[PDB]
Every structure is written in structure tokens, then in C-alpha cells.
Write a protein that holds these residues in place. Structure first.
Motif, PDB file in Angstrom:
ATOM      1  N   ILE A   1       0.831  -1.208   0.000  1.00  0.00           N
ATOM      2  CA  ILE A   1       0.000   0.000   0.000  1.00  0.00           C
ATOM      3  C   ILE A   1       0.863   1.255   0.000  1.00  0.00           C
ATOM      4  CG2 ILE A   1      -1.677   1.370   1.278  1.00  0.00           C
ATOM      5  CD1 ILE A   1      -2.815  -1.127   2.329  1.00  0.00           C
ATOM      6  N   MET A   2       1.878   1.298   0.868  1.00  0.00           N
ATOM      7  CA  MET A   2       2.702   2.500   0.935  1.00  0.00           C
ATOM      8  C   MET A   2       3.413   2.743  -0.386  1.00  0.00           C
ATOM      9  SD  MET A   2       4.419   2.390   4.700  1.00  0.00           S
ATOM     10  CE  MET A   2       4.984   0.705   4.567  1.00  0.00           C
ATOM     11  N   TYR A   3       3.879   1.673  -1.033  1.00  0.00           N
ATOM     12  CA  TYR A   3       4.488   1.817  -2.345  1.00  0.00           C
ATOM     13  C   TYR A   3       3.502   2.400  -3.341  1.00  0.00           C
ATOM     14  CZ  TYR A   3       6.190   0.647  -6.952  1.00  0.00           C
ATOM     15  OH  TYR A   3       6.569   0.705  -8.273  1.00  0.00           O
ATOM     16  N   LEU A   4       2.261   1.902  -3.343  1.00  0.00           N
ATOM     17  CA  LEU A   4       1.270   2.428  -4.279  1.00  0.00           C
ATOM     18  C   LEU A   4       1.057   3.924  -4.075  1.00  0.00           C
ATOM     19  CD1 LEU A   4      -1.288   2.287  -6.218  1.00  0.00           C
ATOM     20  CD2 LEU A   4      -2.563   1.700  -4.142  1.00  0.00           C
ATOM     21  N   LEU A   5       0.882   4.345  -2.821  1.00  0.00           N
ATOM     22  CA  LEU A   5       0.539   5.741  -2.563  1.00  0.00           C
ATOM     23  C   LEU A   5       1.722   6.678  -2.801  1.00  0.00           C
ATOM     24  CD1 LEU A   5      -1.479   5.034   0.671  1.00  0.00           C
ATOM     25  CD2 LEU A   5      -2.467   5.665  -1.524  1.00  0.00           C
ATOM     26  N   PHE A   6       2.916   6.306  -2.334  1.00  0.00           N
ATOM     27  CA  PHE A   6       4.086   7.133  -2.600  1.00  0.00           C
ATOM     28  C   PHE A   6       4.423   7.148  -4.086  1.00  0.00           C
ATOM     29  CE2 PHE A   6       4.449   6.890   1.910  1.00  0.00           C
ATOM     30  CZ  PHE A   6       5.220   7.962   2.302  1.00  0.00           C
ATOM     31  N   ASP A   7       4.140   6.050  -4.796  1.00  0.00           N
ATOM     32  CA  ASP A   7       4.334   6.021  -6.237  1.00  0.00           C
ATOM     33  C   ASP A   7       3.417   7.014  -6.930  1.00  0.00           C
ATOM     34  OD1 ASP A   7       5.323   5.304  -8.675  1.00  0.00           O
ATOM     35  OD2 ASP A   7       4.707   3.200  -8.578  1.00  0.00           O
ATOM     36  N   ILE A   8       2.148   7.072  -6.523  1.00  0.00           N
ATOM     37  CA  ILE A   8       1.239   8.066  -7.095  1.00  0.00           C
ATOM     38  C   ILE A   8       1.726   9.481  -6.788  1.00  0.00           C
ATOM     39  CG2 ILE A   8      -1.133   8.864  -7.146  1.00  0.00           C
ATOM     40  CD1 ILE A   8      -2.013   6.107  -6.351  1.00  0.00           C
ATOM     41  N   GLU A   9       2.255   9.689  -5.582  1.00  0.00           N
ATOM     42  CA  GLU A   9       2.751  11.013  -5.213  1.00  0.00           C
ATOM     43  C   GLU A   9       3.920  11.429  -6.110  1.00  0.00           C
ATOM     44  OE1 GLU A   9       1.782  13.319  -2.863  1.00  0.00           O
ATOM     45  OE2 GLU A   9       1.158  12.329  -1.017  1.00  0.00           O
ATOM     46  N   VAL A  10       4.828  10.490  -6.387  1.00  0.00           N
ATOM     47  CA  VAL A  10       5.923  10.751  -7.320  1.00  0.00           C
ATOM     48  C   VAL A  10       5.392  10.945  -8.741  1.00  0.00           C
ATOM     49  CG1 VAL A  10       8.055   9.781  -8.250  1.00  0.00           C
ATOM     50  CG2 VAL A  10       7.549   9.553  -5.821  1.00  0.00           C
ATOM     51  N   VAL A  11       4.303  10.257  -9.090  1.00  0.00           N
ATOM     52  CA  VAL A  11       3.619  10.492 -10.361  1.00  0.00           C
ATOM     53  C   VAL A  11       3.220  11.952 -10.508  1.00  0.00           C
ATOM     54  CG1 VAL A  11       1.632   9.893 -11.721  1.00  0.00           C
ATOM     55  CG2 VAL A  11       2.856   8.123 -10.608  1.00  0.00           C
ATOM     56  N   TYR A  12       2.646  12.541  -9.461  1.00  0.00           N
ATOM     57  CA  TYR A  12       2.370  13.979  -9.533  1.00  0.00           C
ATOM     58  C   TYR A  12       3.646  14.816  -9.559  1.00  0.00           C
ATOM     59  CZ  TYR A  12      -2.597  13.069  -8.552  1.00  0.00           C
ATOM     60  OH  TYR A  12      -3.906  12.657  -8.606  1.00  0.00           O
ATOM     61  N   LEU A  13       4.702  14.386  -8.867  1.00  0.00           N
ATOM     62  CA  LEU A  13       5.932  15.179  -8.939  1.00  0.00           C
ATOM     63  C   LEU A  13       6.579  15.157 -10.323  1.00  0.00           C
ATOM     64  CD1 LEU A  13       7.474  14.401  -5.470  1.00  0.00           C
ATOM     65  CD2 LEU A  13       6.334  16.497  -6.221  1.00  0.00           C
ATOM     66  N   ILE A  14       6.280  14.149 -11.149  1.00  0.00           N
ATOM     67  CA  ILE A  14       6.914  14.062 -12.474  1.00  0.00           C
ATOM     68  C   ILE A  14       6.611  15.261 -13.363  1.00  0.00           C
ATOM     69  CG2 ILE A  14       7.019  12.717 -14.595  1.00  0.00           C
ATOM     70  CD1 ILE A  14       6.818  10.204 -12.918  1.00  0.00           C
ATOM     71  N   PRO A  15       5.360  15.722 -13.515  1.00  0.00           N
ATOM     72  CA  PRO A  15       5.135  16.896 -14.377  1.00  0.00           C
ATOM     73  C   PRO A  15       5.878  18.142 -13.930  1.00  0.00           C
ATOM     74  CG  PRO A  15       3.109  15.709 -14.124  1.00  0.00           C
ATOM     75  CD  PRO A  15       4.083  15.074 -13.171  1.00  0.00           C
ATOM     76  N   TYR A  16       6.116  18.303 -12.626  1.00  0.00           N
ATOM     77  CA  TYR A  16       6.807  19.497 -12.145  1.00  0.00           C
ATOM     78  C   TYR A  16       8.234  19.574 -12.676  1.00  0.00           C
ATOM     79  CZ  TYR A  16       9.074  22.800  -9.003  1.00  0.00           C
ATOM     80  OH  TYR A  16       9.808  23.840  -8.483  1.00  0.00           O
ATOM     81  N   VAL A  17       8.987  18.474 -12.590  1.00  0.00           N
ATOM     82  CA  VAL A  17      10.367  18.494 -13.057  1.00  0.00           C
ATOM     83  C   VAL A  17      10.441  18.676 -14.564  1.00  0.00           C
ATOM     84  CG1 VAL A  17      11.009  17.028 -11.134  1.00  0.00           C
ATOM     85  CG2 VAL A  17      10.606  15.992 -13.376  1.00  0.00           C
ATOM     86  N   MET A  18       9.340  18.457 -15.274  1.00  0.00           N
ATOM     87  CA  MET A  18       9.288  18.603 -16.722  1.00  0.00           C
ATOM     88  C   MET A  18       8.954  20.017 -17.173  1.00  0.00           C
ATOM     89  SD  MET A  18      10.187  15.811 -17.965  1.00  0.00           S
ATOM     90  CE  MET A  18       9.692  15.949 -19.674  1.00  0.00           C
ATOM     91  N   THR A  19       8.975  20.989 -16.266  1.00  0.00           N
ATOM     92  CA  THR A  19       8.687  22.373 -16.600  1.00  0.00           C
ATOM     93  C   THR A  19       9.773  23.264 -16.022  1.00  0.00           C
ATOM     94  OG1 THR A  19       7.329  22.727 -14.626  1.00  0.00           O
ATOM     95  CG2 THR A  19       6.198  21.959 -16.602  1.00  0.00           C
ATOM     96  N   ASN A  20      10.012  24.391 -16.686  1.00  0.00           N
ATOM     97  CA  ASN A  20      10.897  25.417 -16.146  1.00  0.00           C
ATOM     98  C   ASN A  20      10.054  26.236 -15.177  1.00  0.00           C
ATOM     99  OD1 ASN A  20      13.468  24.976 -17.663  1.00  0.00           O
ATOM    100  ND2 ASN A  20      12.127  25.370 -19.419  1.00  0.00           N
TER     101      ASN A  20
END
Ligand SMILES: CCCCCCCCCCCCCCCCCC(=O)O[C@@H](COC(=O)CCCCCCCCCCCCCCC)COP(=O)(O)OCC[N+](C)(C)C
Lengths: 61, 121
Positions: free
Chosen positions: B69-88
Motif C-alpha cells: 500500500i505505501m508503495y502504491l501511494l508514494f508512487d502516485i505522489e511521485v507520479v504527480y511530482l513528475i510533471p513538475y520536473v518537466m517544466t521550467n
């Protein structure tokens, strides 16, 4: 048998009556937080396992 | 091989030479097909075929649930962090990301405090 049974009864009643006030009040708090700790979904229960006679943290869970 | 079906997709280029060239073309990234996942699927089939050949040759002759469960939820959280690093990012996108990470770190601190991060259980 009646004589012996009342001997045991007297030992118990002597044990209860002979406690000092400070110990009695402490025991009242022990009973109270025993009642509050009956819920096992409390956050603190995840933290620790409490000693039954005195609801003090005995070991971590 | 995706093929254009309309004149606008074909850059208003007339004739049947272009359709013939497009249909029989090779998948070339400099040319029409860029950022194409079709080669990846071809790679998948090639690997599966090689595995099948090897397979058939001899024949002829509580804590785990918690970590899931913790892997699933932290993975989704990193999923949201992915678009941020893709922008200036600007300053305000930055502070929104900081609030997001603050919430994630609060959850992580709850995990640490309750002993779930310890794997004794
Ligand atoms: C940033 C990169 C990631 C960091 C990881 C996230 C945070 C990890 C969790 C840290 C946990 C450290 C050990 C856990 C123990 C603990 O933190 O609680 C302790 C200690 O509490 C602490 O604060 C220790 C500092 C640990 C840092 C945790 C601070 C919160 C960090 C999360 C911030 C979330 C962002 C929200 C904004 C209990 O406090 P007591 O001292 O027992 O208080 C009761 C005693 N008294 C009689 C005096 C009342």
C-alpha cells in the motif's frame, strides 16, 4: 469451610482497606485510563503495549 | 504503420506517389515517425519469440501488504511530482510543489512515528 472461606474473605478486605490515600487515587486513575484504553484503534496503542495491572507503557508494538 | 488519409494530413500534396511512399516507408525518426512506440512493440514481440524458441527446444528432445500500500501511494505522489520536473518552474509553481511535498512528508512522518517504517511487525 465457612470458617476458612471467611478467612480468605478477611484477607481480601484487609488488603483493600489498608491502602493509603495516594495509592487509592493512583488506582482510581489506573481504572479510569484502563477504561479509556479499551479502544484498541487508538493511536497510542499502535505506539505501545501497556501493562495490564498498571496501564504504563511496557513494550513498543 | 499509420498512414495519412486526408489531403490536409498529406500537406496538400497531390498524386499517388506520396501514398505509395508513405505505405511502404521505413520507420525513421528523422522522417515521418518521430517519438514512435511501434519499434518498442516490435522489440517486445522479438523478445517473446526468442523466449518461446528457448522454451520449446528442450520439450521436443501483514508487513508485505503494508509495504504494497505505501508503495502504491508514494508512487502516485511521485507520479504527480513528475510533471513538475518537466517544466521550467516559476516561484509559485515551486511553492505549490512545496505544499505538495509538505503533505507527503507529513504522511511519511506519520509512518515513522507509528512504527510502520520499522519492519518488526
Ligand atoms: C525532509 C526529507 C524527509 C524527512 C522525513 C520525514 C520526517 C521523518 C520522521 C522523523 C521521525 C524521527 C523520529 C520519530 C520520533 C518523533 O519525531 O517524535 C518524538 C520527537 O518529536 C520530534 O519532534 C523529534 C523531531 C523529529 C522530526 C519530526 C518533525 C516533523 C517532521 C515532518 C514535517 C511534516 C511537514 C508538515 C509541515 C516524540 O516527541 P517527544 O520528545 O516524545 O515529546 C513528548 C515528550 N514530552 C514529555 C516532552 C512532551
Amino acid at each position: 469451610s465457612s470458617a476458612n472461606n471467611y478467612d480468605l474473605l478477611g484477607q481480601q478486605h484487609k488488603f483493600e482497606n489498608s491502602k493509603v490515600f495516594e495509592e487509592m487515587l493512583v488506582e482510581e486513575e489506573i481504572a479510569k485510563d484502563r477504561e479509556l484504553l479499551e479502544d484498541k484503534n487508538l493511536a497510542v496503542h499502535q505506539l505501545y503495549i501497556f501493562d495490564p495491572q498498571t496501564q504504563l507503557a511496557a513494550r513498543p508494538r | 504503420l499509420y498512414n495519412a488519409m486526408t489531403p490536409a494530413q498529406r500537406y496538400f500534396v497531390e498524386g499517388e506517389h506520396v501514398v505509395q511512399a508513405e505505405a511502404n516507408r521505413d520507420i525513421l525518426f528523422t522522417q515521418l515517425d518521430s517519438n514512435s512506440y511501434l519499434p518498442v512493440l516490435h522489440y517486445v514481440l522479438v523478445g517473446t519469440a526468442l523466449g518461446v524458441v528457448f522454451l520449446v527446444l528442450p520439450l521436443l528432445i501483514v508487513s508485505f501488504y503494508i509495504v504494497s500500500i505505501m508503495y502504491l501511494l508514494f508512487d502516485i505522489e511521485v507520479v504527480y511530482l513528475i510533471p513538475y520536473v518537466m517544466t521550467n518552474a516559476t516561484e509559485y509553481m515551486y511553492w505549490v510543489m512545496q505544499t505538495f511535498v509538505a503533505i507527503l512528508v507529513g504522511g511519511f512522518f506519520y509512518e515513522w512515528r507509528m512504527g510502520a517504517l520499522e519492519w518488526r511487525e
